[PDB]
């Protein structure tokens, strides 16, 4: 347990990067319905 002040920014940046990669990956086009 550290919960350093920088941990919040590191976590938010990590989630932002992961979400951007997920959104721009083929997985999001797959998520859109075919019909």
């Amino acid at each position: 347990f550290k919960e350093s002040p920088l941990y919040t920014i590191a976590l938010n940046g990590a989630f932002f990067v992961a979400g951007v990669a997920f959104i721009q990956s083929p997985l999001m086009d797959m998520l859109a319905p075919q019909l």
Binding site: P5, I9, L11, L31
Partner: protein, 307 residues
């Protein structure tokens, strides 16, 4: 500057529309409500746009018990008054001097106190957009400026990237010097316009940066991460599905709350909204349905509405 007009840039969107693609389209921040609410809209004309909306919201703290609002809009002039319960009058007037230049004045009044009165002039150009607004403007005997004044400038450096700044002047009482801050904003548009990224290094070290993607004509998704001593920020993931019959909007927040907003168009006029949210950090839910009735009062308008 003839030789330096060869680049032929495109005008970037205004400063307030920087996050429109995400904050106001693929998120529930503006559409969310709680408890029941019936919204009756009356349309009286089409060419010169006129409308007379009504509201009946119960169980929502943010919303009022009743709210009468008449919206008038034509080619170059847009006005809207909004009476509310407790005689809290709100109003907005937009006048476009030129096609690309518009001056907007908002005014909200509650129990005889004009709490909000902001006048702003918006100037859009071939490559840059600049708008200046003055919140609660006034003058004092000592002669110095009073109230809050904000000026923002956005210039397109390249067709796919625009940079700008937002200058803020705020003075509360006028006795003490008015703190002034500057905010930096960036907007990147993909060559294909498939995805749009925008970053905002707001004042006080605040960083509101978002991303937007258009998966298809129906599905568009975006992400927004906010940051604000110790920081207090949240990351939001959102998506929206628009069809000929309904509009869906979902969002998973970093705080843990999961929300959705379904608007079924049972009829061309009547639309039944559903808006439910969950708060997994405290395990409580806030859900509210509603209504949206769009009934005309003129034979021509009804004929147009039915096709």
């Amino acid at each position: 500057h003839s030789h330096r007009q060869s680049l032929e840039l495109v005008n970037p969107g205004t400063v307030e529309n920087l996050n429109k693609e995400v904050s106001r389209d693929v998120f529930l921040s503006q559409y969310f409500f709680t408890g029941l609410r019936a919204d009756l809209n009356k349309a009286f004309s089409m060419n010169p746009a006129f409308q007379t909306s009504h509201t009946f919201s119960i169980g929502s703290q943010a919303l009022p018990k009743y709210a009468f609002s008449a919206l008038f809009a034509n080619d170059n002039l847009f006005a809207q008054g909004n009476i509310d319960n407790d005689l809290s009058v709100s109003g907005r007037l937009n006048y476009g001097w030129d096609k690309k230049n518009i001056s907007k004045v908002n005014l909200q009044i509650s129990d005889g106190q004009p709490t909000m009165c902001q006048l702003e002039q918006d100037y859009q150009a071939s490559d840059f957009s600049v708008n200046v607004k003055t919140l609660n403007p006034s003058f004092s005997e000592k002669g110095e400026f009073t109230g809050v004044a904000v000026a923002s400038f956005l210039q397109s450096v390249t067709p796919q990237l625009a940079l700008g700044l937002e200058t803020l002047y705020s003075r509360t009482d006028g006795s003490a010097p008015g703190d002034a801050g500057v905010s930096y904003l960036t907007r990147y548009v993909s060559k294909k316009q498939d995805w749009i990224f925008s970053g905002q290094l707001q004042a006080n070290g605040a960083l509101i940066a978002s991303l937007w993607r258009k998966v298809a004509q129906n599905v568009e998704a975006g992400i927004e991460t906010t940051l604000q001593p110790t920081v207090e920020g949240s990351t939001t993931i959102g998506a929206k599905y628009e069809y000929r019959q309904s509009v869906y909007r979902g969002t998973l927040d970093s705080n843990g709350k999961v929300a959705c907003f379904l608007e079924r168009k049972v009829l061309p006029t009547l639309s039944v909204l559903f808006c439910g949210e969950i708060d997994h950090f405290k395990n409580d839910t806030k859900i509210g349905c509603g209504l949206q009735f769009e009934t005309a009062g003129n034979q021509e308008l009804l004929m147009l509405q039915q096709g």
